[PDB]
Amino acid sequence: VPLDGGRFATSDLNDLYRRVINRNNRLKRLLDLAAPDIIVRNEKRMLQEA
RNA sequence: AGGAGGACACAAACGGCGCGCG
């Protein structure tokens, strides 16, 4: 929902979904580009925690 | 002369902090 002026009120679930989507897209991008095992492990841990 | 031809619809939100009252 917007608030007074050209701004939208912060939504809790939206930000969590945004974090999850960004992390998962980064993981997909790396897995396409064959990142090293250490990097993909760290990305997978970050995705799980997100 | 005769004769012939010729736009309908549509009324303000969500979480903290503080205070106060029952």
Q: Which experimental technique did the depositors report for determining this structure?
A: cryo-EM
Residue A36 tokens read as 């090293």
Distance from first CA to last CA of chain A, Å, rounded? 25
Alpha-carbon distance of A12 to A19, in angstroms, equals 11
Question: Is the CB of residue A34 inside 7 Å of nucleic acid strand B?
Answer: no
Q: Report how far residue A20's alpha carbon sits from residue A23's, in angstroms, rounded to the nearest whole number.
A: 5
A29 to A5, A32, A33, A43, A48: CA distances (angstroms): 37, 5, 6, 11, 17
| Alpha-carbon span A14 to A31, nearest angstrom | 26
- Pairing between β-strand A2-3 and β-strand A7-8 as defined by DSSP bridges: antiparallel
As a rounded value in angstroms, the CA-to-C1' distance for A14 and B5 is 110
